[PDB]
Each structure stands twice: as structure tokens, then as C-alpha cells.
Design a binder for this molecule. Structure first.
Ligand SMILES: C[C@@H]1O[C@@H](O[C@H]2[C@H](O[C@H]3[C@H](O)[C@@H](O)[C@H](O)O[C@@H]3CO)O[C@H](CO)[C@H](O)[C@@H]2O)[C@@H](O)[C@H](O)[C@@H]1O
Length: 231
């Protein structure tokens, strides 16, 4: 019924919201079965259409700068954590620069009987062998994986699940994030690095193809469902 969308645009990144939002209204989960809430974490004063729409929730979040912008992701999600458990059945995170090209239905929702959790295959690694996966390799990070270990390389920019299951992931990973800071370790790919470990312990109930991560200006043997805008 309810779909929480988590979205972060700080500094200039807010220039992505307008279109992400618009496309979402056309394509993403449009069935009267679903009510979509938008949690948009930003330091910008006003979003687009934020005045007319009651489902656009601006959350005041200052600019953390790179990498902490991406690194602190679950720290930032967890501020409204209690709100999130109230208002949403499912959560999904989109990288700021995504654009919906095609209709997305209930096909992507993890079942009940599952662990249900969702992840997308990184577009750069879908055609490569796991030696080529950019997994954090220092056993000093929480995000470390043994060489020749792991099934897929998962992307930072789209993830989700049952609200209860994806939050456990935010807190769990949020903690790993914190442990590494105590060791002065920053995983190589940051949150992506860490989510891949979690999805190693936790194979995701749904693994979406790279079509959902299709880069703008790459040729790939899929139809793009979701597109990645190029800066
Ligand atoms: C899709 C890509 O996302 C950002 O960069 C990601 C980076 O992309 C590499 C990819 O790893 C490589 O295999 C492919 O052939 O070329 C891309 C070069 O851009 O991959 C790492 C994983 O190691 C992270 O996922 C990075 O976020 C972005 O900055 C790129 O512009 C592009 O949109």
C-alpha cells in the first residue's frame, strides 16, 4: 500500500529533484493501490511543487560534503526512523540523478515469505567476473570481503525492502559505518562497499538487473527502465 522513497539532495544536487520527482509521478508505482511518500533530505530552502503536494516531506539536512554525503546515508535516514515506521510499508532509495523512463509496478516488491530486501546489479560490473568486483578488501573494514567471495556487485544508488527489513539494514550498516570511523577506516566505495557485505550475509530477495541502473550514454543490452542522468 504505502511506498516510502528516500532521497537526498544537498548543495546543488537539488537540481535533480524536479525531474526525478516528475518522472516518479508518471512511472513509479502508479496504481491506486499505492500511496507514495517522498522523504527528501536537503539543505535547500524549497523543493519543487513542495507547496501543492502533501506527500513531499522536506527534511532539513545540512550539506555534509563528500564522501560523508553518501557515507552517512543511513545516519540521515534514521533521523525520521520512527516517522518511517509509521507512514510506510516499503522503503526504496534512489540516487539523486535517476530518471524514470518506463512504468514500474508491484513486480519489484519483495514478498512476505522472503527476507525481502532488494538490490540492483551495478551496471559496470554485471558483465565481469568476481575478481573484478570492487568489494572492500581490507579485513580491517566491516565491509571487507574475502577474495573470490560474493555473487554480485550491488550499486549504492537503488535499494529497498519491507520497511522493517530495510531499516534493520540502515541501523546495522549505520553501525558498521561508525565502527570503521573508530578505526579511521573509510570503505573504498563507502555505503556501496558496505551494502555489498550486508547483501553477502543477506542475499537480497530481489535482484534487479542493470536496466534499473542504465547509465545515460552507455550502450547496454537492455531496455532502460530507469536511467542515470549524466552530470
Ligand atoms: C555508473 C557510474 O556511477 C558513478 O561511478 C561508480 C563507478 O563506475 C565505474 C564502474 O565501476 C566501472 O566498472 C565502469 O566500467 O565505469 C564506471 C566509470 O564511471 O563504479 C564504482 C564501483 O567501483 C562506484 O559504483 C562509483 O559510484 C559515477 O561517478 C559515473 O559517472 C557513472 O555514472
Amino acid at each position: 500500500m504505502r511506498i516510502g522513497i528516500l532521497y537526498i539532495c544537498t548543495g546543488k544536487y537539488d537540481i535533480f529533484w524536479k525531474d526525478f520527482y516528475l518522472s516518479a509521478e508518471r512511472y513509479f508505482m502508479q496504481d491506486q493501490s499505492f500511496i507514495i511518500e517522498y522523504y527528501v533530505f536537503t539543505d535547500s530552502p524549497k523543493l519543487y511543487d513542495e507547496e501543492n503536494n502533501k506527500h513531499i516531506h522536506r527534511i532539513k539536512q545540512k550539506n555534509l560534503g563528500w564522501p560523508d554525503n553518501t557515507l552517512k546515508r543511513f545516519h540521515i535516514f534514521l533521523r525520521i526512523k520512527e516517522q518511517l515506521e509509521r507512514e510506510t510499508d516499503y522503503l526504496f532509495f534512489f540516487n539523486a540523478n535517476l530518471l524514470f523512463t518506463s512504468p514500474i509496478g508491484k513486480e519489484i516488491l519483495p514478498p512476505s515469505d522472503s527476507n525481502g530486501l532488494l538490490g540492483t546489479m551495478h551496471p559496470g560490473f554485471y558483465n565481469k567476473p568476481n575478481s573484478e568486483f570492487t568489494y572492500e578488501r581490507r579485513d580491517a573494514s566491516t565491509a571487507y570481503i574475502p577474495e573470490g567471495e560474493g555473487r554480485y556487485y550491488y550499486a549504492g544508488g537503488l535499494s529497498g525492502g519491507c520497511t522493517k527489513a530495510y531499516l534493520k539494514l540502515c541501523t546495522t550498516i549505520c553501525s558498521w559505518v561508525d565502527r570503521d570511523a573508530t578505526n579511521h577506516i573509510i570503505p573504498i566505495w563507502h555505503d556501496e562497499s558496505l551494502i555489498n557485505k550486508y547483501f553477502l550475509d543477506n542475499p537480497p530477495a530481489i535482484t534487479l538487473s542493470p536496466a534499473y541502473l542504465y547509465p545515460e550514454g552507455w550502450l547496454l543490452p537492455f531496455e532502460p527502465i530507469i536511467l542515470i542522468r549524466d552530470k
